Amino acid sequence: SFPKYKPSRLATLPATLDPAEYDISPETRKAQAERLAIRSRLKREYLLQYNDPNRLGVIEDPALIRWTYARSANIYPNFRPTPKTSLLGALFGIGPLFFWYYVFKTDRDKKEKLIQEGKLDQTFNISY
């Protein structure tokens, strides 16, 4: 009984240690065959175009076009102001700005106070 491997988000569970890889059913095997069918059809189309002696240029992959569109164009059309979206947007957009305002304003005010009280050393600070 060696210690078990706790999978995490940055440490995925090894297939060998997958509890489902050892409980297989007829439906699962059928699904695996269907997935291989999909892959084989896609690879056939790709290789047919890739080995074509007449083809000159890129083999436009619809998947790449879809990925780029989904990552750029489709975002706003499929966005709805929601409690999560609104709160996260508020926090991550305006929150940091006010934190940095607090920090810089406090530092600058302290510096100005010290300068006014003549209690800051700028003996050789002659290049601002």
């Binding site: 050892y22 409980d23 297989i24 059913s25 007829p26 699962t28 095997r29």
Partner: protein, 240 residues
């Protein structure tokens, strides 16, 4: 006769010793070469639905099914042997054939005999008739045993119309192979069993039984030790 449980299925033939070969032949034919004809499938669907309606009357079976549902919720053990009515109506010949193929396998079957049976004769008959059955799984699809979680829970179906109340309470118990089963069985024997028909009544050694008889607390009370491979239900059922 046949009996199906959540963990075991059995077909046994009571017969004379001189008829052992024919009994073995019939058992082999039943186990392996079962027609599963569709018309019989429809008739048995009707019968099974009617019997599901009947079992609802049997309060004890209903209460034990509820106990399994609540205690082993989220696990295969919660499922009843008969199954939901929707599944019964939706079942098909393909599903029954697949069940027979996946679960009826030689390594998972035992041919047992008692009485005037010679072991050599039984072994020879089994080789003659049961040899064909195989333990290979089609397309390497092997069912995997799953440990079942026991959840402390309460399921209360309140039907005040019902004459008497059935309650079953259990705690998780040992598996079949756990050595602790014997002492727990001794303790349950200490707790005992009582029914209103019992003659002993007040003088019965079991304190619960004596008190129930003296106060007429319960019509019947029994202690059960239900054991499955990795878990079990240990407790009591009392009608009061």
């Amino acid at each position: 006769n046949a009996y199906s449980t959540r963990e075991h299925t059995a077909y046994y033939i009571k017969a004379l010793s001189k008829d052992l070969p024919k009994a073995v032949e019939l058992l082999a034919d039943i186990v392996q070469n079962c027609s599963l004809e569709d018309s019989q499938i429809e008739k048995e669907r009707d019968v099974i639905l009617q019997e599901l309606q009947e079992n609802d009357s049997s309060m004890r079976d209903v209460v034990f099914d509820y106990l399994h549902a609540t205690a082993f919720q989220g696990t295969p053990l919660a499922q009843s042997v008969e199954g939901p009515s929707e599944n019964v109506r939706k079942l098909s010949r393909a599903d029954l054939t697949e069940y027979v193929s996946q679960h009826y396998k030689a390594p998972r079957m035992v041919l047992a005999a008692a009485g005037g049976v010679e072991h050599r004769q039984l072994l020879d008959l089994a080789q003659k008739h049961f040899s064909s059955l195989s333990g290979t799984y089609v397309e390497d699809a092997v069912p995997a045993f799953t440990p079942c979680r026991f959840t402390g829970s309460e399921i209360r179906h309140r039907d005040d119309a019902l004459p008497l109340a059935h309650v079953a309470i259990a705690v998780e118990g040992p598996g079949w192979a756990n050595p602790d089963n014997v002492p727990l069985q001794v303790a349950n024997a200490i707790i005992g069993h009582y029914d209103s028909t019992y003659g002993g009544g007040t003088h019965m050694s079991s304190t619960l039984a004596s008190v129930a008889a003296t106060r007429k607390l319960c019509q019947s009370f029994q202690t059960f030790n239900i054991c499955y491979a990795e878990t079990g239900l240990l407790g009591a059922h009392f009608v009061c």
